Design a protein around this ligand. Structure first.
Ligand SMILES: *CC(=O)[C@H](CCCCN)NS(=O)(=O)c1ccc(C)cc1
Ligand SMILES: [K+]
Ligand code: NA
Ligand code: NA
Ligand SMILES: [Pb+2]
Length: 452
């Protein structure tokens, strides 16, 4: 079925194509340096290059050729990072949504589904891009001073006199029943099922790892309980950055005359989110219900895990797969698509949802699920020069990367017996301190060095 044929795009070695506005060259460097250190093979291009350009058609042609060439060489990009607002990378109007979308950068030349996990670091200045990057680096390197906020979430079924009880509450209650609960490590599941909502957004300030709102939205607000872009700019969650998901209308409409909610929540300095998932056009109650919970969910009936297909919540908590921000969105879209395929009540085509939902901020982040675990490994005392590979001990499934000065030299995934064969695409031929990074979904990163 669609889940088998069009599942999680994540693969190793991780490869990322980056297309960035030329103004961002300096500000982007620390993000690129870290992505290389953690094992991403990067192909980085700026819109001031003739082969890229600043116009939709050239950027799209450039990306599609990179993807096709990569695939032919058994090295397809996994991620596509768009760096800039619509003044430098425009997107285009959805065929179904009639609103801006980045989908066609990733759907190569004739395909329904994206070929790459695409996200947009939308910034109007280098300073704003730095704001996003610094939050991402704190989160991914786990350098936050107090990790207790990771064990807390905020879940809101927002106001609608009729739909809140029919769909909003069932959505949030499903998430809490199966995942966002004490038995998964969450000490504080702040949840608002209906009015009174007073106090709900103060939890963004005191600290949560995740905020999910489902009900009405506008380009610059979660409508009720109200959270506007003005309020975002006044948040105080220093060192406590979250993933936010707005299952509502138009909060990710990133070509609006004013910065949209999704842009502001990621752009704000030392507060707000490291990433946002939301919709560029309108969203709808049925389709968002399926997106979060899975297909077969019914209005006014509490859905079960056994009675629904895989939705975004379900995918998030699979340990093995769907471990990136982009993959959470993908899972949601798949569920809405499946719901249509098997004949659930839908009044819009699945094409619309793939055009609608976007990641703003860094979609390549692997979110923690409550408190992340401590990894186990052994660091060798030295690396002999001129080797095609090294054997590095790390827990099964861990991804090990060897680098120096932001140049990635080799990567490998630890097998079931706790040994990674790190394939050296660039061999070590000079003395120096080499960086070794080991990452794994819901584990604290290991960031060390080995002297050669
Ligand atoms: C516009 C909006 O935010 C809501 C979101 C509902 C889904 C919440 N998960 N859309 S709507 O269904 O209320 C809607 C209202 C009017 C029009 C013209 C389109 C959609
Ligand atoms: K309504
Ligand atoms: Na489900
Ligand atoms: Na997962
Ligand atoms: Pb914008």
């Amino acid at each position: 079925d669609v889940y088998t044929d069009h599942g999680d795009l994540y693969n190793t070695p991780v490869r990322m194509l980056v297309v960035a506005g030329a103004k961002f060259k300096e500000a982007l460097k620390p993000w690129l340096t870290w992505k290389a250190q953690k094992g991403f093979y990067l192909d980085v291009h700026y819109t001031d290059e003739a082969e890229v350009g600043t116009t939709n058609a050239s950027i799209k042609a450039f990306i599609h050729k990179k993807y096709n060439d990569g695939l032919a060489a058994s090295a397809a990009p996994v991620f596509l990072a768009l760096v800039g607002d619509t003044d430098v990378i425009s997107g285009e109007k959805g065929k179904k949504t009639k609103k801006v979308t980045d989908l066609y950068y990733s759907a190569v030349d004739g395909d329904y589904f994206p070929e790459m996990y695409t996200f947009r670091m939308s910034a109007s200045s280098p300073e704003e891009l730095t704001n996003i990057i610094d939050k991402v680096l704190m989160y991914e390197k786990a350098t936050m001073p107090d990790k207790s906020y990771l064990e807390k979430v905020l879940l809101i079924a927002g106001a609608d006199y009729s739909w809140n009880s029919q769909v909003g509450q069932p959505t949030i209650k499903y998430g809490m029943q199966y995942y966002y609960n004490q038995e998964h490590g969450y000490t504080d599941v702040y949840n608002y099922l209906k009015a009174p909502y007073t106090g709900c957004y103060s939890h963004l300030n005191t600290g949560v790892s995740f905020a999910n709102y489902t009900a009405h939205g506008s380009e610059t607000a979660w409508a009720d309980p109200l959270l506007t872009t003005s309020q975002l700019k006044a948040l105080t969650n220093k060192d406590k950055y979250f993933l936010a998901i707005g299952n509502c209308c138009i909060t990710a409409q990133f070509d609006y005359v004013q910065p949209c909610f999704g842009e502001v929540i990621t752009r704000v300095k030392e507060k707000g989110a490291y990433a946002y998932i939301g919709s560029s056009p309108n969203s709808y109650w049925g389709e968002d219900y399926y997106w979060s919970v899975g297909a077969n969910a019914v209005f006014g009936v509490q859905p079960t895990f056994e009675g629904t297909s895989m939705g975004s919540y379900d995918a998030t908590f699979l340990e093995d797969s769907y471990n990136t921000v982009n993959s959470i969105m993908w899972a949601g879209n798949l569920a809405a698509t499946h719901a249509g395929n098997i004949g659930n009540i839908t009044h819009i085509g699945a094409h619309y949802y793939w055009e609608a939902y976007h990641v703003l901020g860094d979609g390549s982040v692997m979110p923690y699920r409550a408190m992340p675990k401590t990894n186990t490994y052994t660091l060798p005392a030295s690396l002999p020069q001129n080797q095609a590979s090294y054997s590095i001990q790390a827990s099964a499934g861990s991804y090990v990367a060897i680098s120096k000065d932001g140049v990635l030299y080799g990567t490998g995934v630890a097998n079931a017996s706790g040994v990674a064969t790190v394939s050296m695409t660039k061999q070590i031929t000079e003395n120096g301190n080499y960086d070794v990074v080991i990452t794994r979904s819901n584990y604290l990163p290991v960031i060390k060095q080995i002297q050669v």
